[PDB]
Amino acid sequence: MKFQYKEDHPFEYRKKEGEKIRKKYPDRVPVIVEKAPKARVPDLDKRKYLVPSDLTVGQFYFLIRKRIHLRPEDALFFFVNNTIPPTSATMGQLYEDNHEEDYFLYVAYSDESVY
Amino acid sequence: STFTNISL
């Protein structure tokens, strides 16, 4: 999927951090958020997040739109494992169903509805 | 490497 976070961090390091943070914060989930390749939108100022497990995917989506300063008129989509996630899922549910072997959840965003 | 915390 090409996340710069993976390019910058050896797997063993990611897995150790993800396991530790999930044990430490049972009510939060570790999430990497990055702009998809080719997307015509801003990069986020931060890519590594600790997100409340009860926040919904839809709420997190609107928060990300604000953090990249997107006008409400503009398009944006999330991709998790190359799939647009259900907006009513909580971030904890999305994490449980989609975290990688390093215990991080990865979310890409794009102005195009295809990753 | 710090995490950015999202508040509820």
Author numbering:
A (entry chain A): 1 to 115
B (entry chain P): 12 to 19
Question: What did the paper state?
Answer:
Autophagy-related 8 (ATG8) proteins play a central role in autophagosome formation and selective delivery of cytoplasmic cargo to lysosomes by recruiting autophagy adaptors and receptors. A genome wide siRNA screen identified the short coiled-coil protein (SCOC) as a novel positive regulator of starvation induced autophagy. To further understand the role of SCOC in autophagy, we identified a functional LIR motif in the unstructured region N-terminal of the coiled-coil domain of SCOC.
In both structures SCOC formed the same canonical LIR interactions with GABARAPL1 for the SCOC WT LIR-GABARAP complex. In the SCOC-2pS LIR, the phosphoserine pS12 formed a large network of electrostatic interactions with H9GABL1, K48GABL1 and R47GABL1, while pS18 was not interacting with GABARAPL1. Notably, in the SCOC-2pS LIR:GABARAPL1 complex structure phosphorylated S18SCOC was solvent exposed and not interacting with GABARAPL1. In the SCOC-2pS LIR:GABARAPL1 structure electrostatic interactions with the more distant SCOC LIR domain residues (E10SCOC (X−4) and D11SCOC (X−3)) were not detected and may not be required for LIR binding to GABARAPL1 due to additional interactions established by phosphorylated S12SCOC. S12SCOC phosphorylation enhanced the affinity of the SCOC LIR motif to LC3s rather than GABARAPs. Since the LDS of LC3 subfamily proteins has more basic residues at the edge of HP1 (R10/R11LC3A/B and R16/K17LC3C on helix α1), a larger network of electrostatic interactions with acidic or phosphorylated LIR residues in position X−2 to X−4 can be formed, which promotes more binding to LC3s than GABARAPs. Similarly, S12SCOC phosphorylation rescued ATG8 binding after deletion of aa 6–10 (positon X−4 to X−8).
